[PDB]
Design a protein around this nucleic acid. Sequence first.
RNA 1: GGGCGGCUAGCUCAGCGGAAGAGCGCUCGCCUCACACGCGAGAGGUCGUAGGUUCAAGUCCUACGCCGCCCACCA
Length: 862
Amino acid sequence: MDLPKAYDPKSVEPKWAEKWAKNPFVANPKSGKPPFVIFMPPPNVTGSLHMGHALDNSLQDALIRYKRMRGFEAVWLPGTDHAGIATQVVVERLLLKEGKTRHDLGREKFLERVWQWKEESGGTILKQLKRLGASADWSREAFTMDEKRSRAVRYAFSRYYHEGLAYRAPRLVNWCPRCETTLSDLEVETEPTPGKLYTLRYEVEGGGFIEIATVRPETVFADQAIAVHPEDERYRHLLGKRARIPLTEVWIPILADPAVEKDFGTGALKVTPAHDPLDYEIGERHGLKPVSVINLEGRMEGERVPEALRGLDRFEARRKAVELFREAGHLVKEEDYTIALATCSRCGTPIEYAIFPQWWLRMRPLAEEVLKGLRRGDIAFVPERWKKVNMDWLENVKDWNISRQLWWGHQIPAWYCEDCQAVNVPRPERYLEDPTSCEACGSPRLKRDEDVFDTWFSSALWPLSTLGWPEETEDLKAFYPGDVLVTGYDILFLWVSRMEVSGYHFMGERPFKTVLLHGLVLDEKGQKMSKSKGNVIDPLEMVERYGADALRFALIYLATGGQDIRLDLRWLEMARNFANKLYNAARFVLLSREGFQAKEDTPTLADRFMRSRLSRGVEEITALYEALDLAQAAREVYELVWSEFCDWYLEAAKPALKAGNAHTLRTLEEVLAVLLKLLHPMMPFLTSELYQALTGKEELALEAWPEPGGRDEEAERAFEALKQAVTAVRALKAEAGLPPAQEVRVYLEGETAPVEENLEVFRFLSRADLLPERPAKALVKAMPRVTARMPLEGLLDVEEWRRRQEKRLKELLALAERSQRKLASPGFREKAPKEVVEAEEARLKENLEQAERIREALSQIG
RNA sequence: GGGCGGCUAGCUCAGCGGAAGAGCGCUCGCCUCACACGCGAGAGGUCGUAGGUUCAAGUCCUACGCCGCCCACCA
Ligand SMILES: CC(C)[C@H](N)C(=O)NS(=O)(=O)NC[C@H]1O[C@@H](n2cnc3c(N)ncnc32)[C@H](O)[C@@H]1O
């Protein structure tokens, strides 16, 4: 230890960070010690980490460390996620911001550049976590696209397919013509945008009219019906007729359908299954054959599409499309409108739609496999309000498109016969085998799906792929049901649920026993922190400015009840300042036991007090950790250390130390140990440095959690008496306008036994000598247990003392009033505890007694 | 259209059935021999509104008001 005046994290953290980095806390399946498991949610290989991740891992670490030194086999599986779609976009940008882009350089040369990036980003992420003191079993670091994990998916898919659950068809898919790939619902964002709602109208067979309101005019040529609510009899004479479509000679039918909202536009809508999910739905509800007018490049093409209108852009197609309507006479009324325009969550461009042969996953069945558990009580949720939010999600699931036309992810394991057009999917038993002949036509010619999987598809395979489940390892046997899943609600759907499936379906058991959902950190502005918003702060920018133990402490302190966390640097100071206080407290004890000269070993009230107040602390804090309420523990230990140890105990001990008392110097050292223990999970660095200098131990992390010792009833009540006498006096001086160090005489009445037995402490703390005889005239301070009288010697600020006391009375009678009203209240007398009632009575007893002392003094004073 | 979270001291946030709290800021004193990233003494809240339950309500029930999320096929 190098005990300077102020604590410099930079002289401590880095050396320990490295010591822990180079020598991980490796897990042992045969440790024959109760395990505790946590799967770290793998950070996306896109850039660095931000304060969010920090909150996330900081919480995890604190649990790992606690559990570890609590007696378990702390297993925290680290790892990074390839991000798929994400990383893709990221590397593309780096490229273009150079000159060339994706297509510009093959599917190889590019797939290369992405890995180089996977290294930078994946590497940086690891440092960051190491520097934040992550005691993660880096021996088992995993990576979504490493051999051991790529096997987890490939097998997972195989079992799915050959099980039926994973199929291939042409359901409708949300497609982004930017990235050229299908997305999933959860992957697209519908952000309200100003547009135009056009009402077109056209010829009915025999009769003459039908009117429709569509945001996209171009999608008319691909119509297959006009839908009208079932009960909207305003169309009763149009129901079942026809409709030449504008510019066409195509005659669409007029059908009913519950999905038509009569009150929107005209009571009827156009139906275009090949270009929209609502129409596709209604479409395939009256069996309407799909038909497209625009291709994946987002351009015009099709049978219906009219000459000269086929070709150019999807939008530059509706402009000229409208003019050909009104000027042709079918465009009735156009008008502004705020449309719920769907865009690609990761590139912005508005998604299109298309029927494509893709890989889907019968979610309906799986989802229930999970609900079975939740329903039973298998999984626990911390905020707990998320149980429902989860279940209700699974309640209404929709077959998930697993395919992706991206160049990143896992090349799916499916082979297509260039002859009988059949799919060849390796079986479980030989999942690793690449078919060489079609099991349909027996042909040798085969072609493998060039698609890729959804990053979210592999990620749902984590509580398994980190334990080598592609196979059947010992890790997976020793610790599969994870103990607590830490993550922020932002991915409770695309991860937590997805994983609950893999777990209940591939293992028939909860992937984890408790799901811990913490809020999200967000810029001061109140909005979420994320690479996308461009509102991110590197955790290392903060660590270098306040220190890792600080950053860790802020973040935990603030993570209360799964609530979000608004960025407020003030909280980072809060933390730093506290580290420093903890530090100083330690410096004092270290510098104290310096050249100490033992001269007695006498138990001191102050000692017996802090020991007791400590058990109280250990008990409380443990239970808090036991309830996964770290944020609370954080402020409960702040309390202990600062307000009970530094503010009162250390001070109360200085005289005894000058007096060369060993029992005290001892107690200080012992109490400081336990405290360093308690604080460790949150502030690991400083807490270790200190503990080593204090006891020689080089790995506090491995020490055992403290157990509450005794608890001294009287002692605690005795020392409170003291605290009061001391504060009374220093409150008097304050009011009198007397300087702090000013020598002073005082007289005490009441529970004074404590002050008498521990004179020197009283003196040292109040800076006052005790008067044997009560002074006639004097300034008075009335405290609950004790009362203080200060002689009128010197120049005192009576106006102040007056005001202050004229104000305590204004309050003591007020308190007496409330109590009276209670005690004499209907029902309160007996309908309340035989305790809260007799005590609320002992409040009245003394609120008066004090009000009296003050009243008398207050008036007595000339 | 549904759900949810928030609304407590100037600011940022805890508390969530029995006498209103923290950090910072502010006022007054202090370089008191661990700490000025500090010490001591104070000021500052009818706990978003309207009801209701209960001996007892920021703390529970009920509508509502704003701020923000998530989910949904109003073309
Ligand atoms: C499979 C998933 C783990 C995926 N690779 C992924 O979620 N990758 S990530 O970079 O977004 N990291 C997400 C994890 O970090 C948390 N997180 C991300 N942003 C924040 C934030 N602003 N506040 C609090 N927590 C946040 C998520 O809870 C998740 O654990």
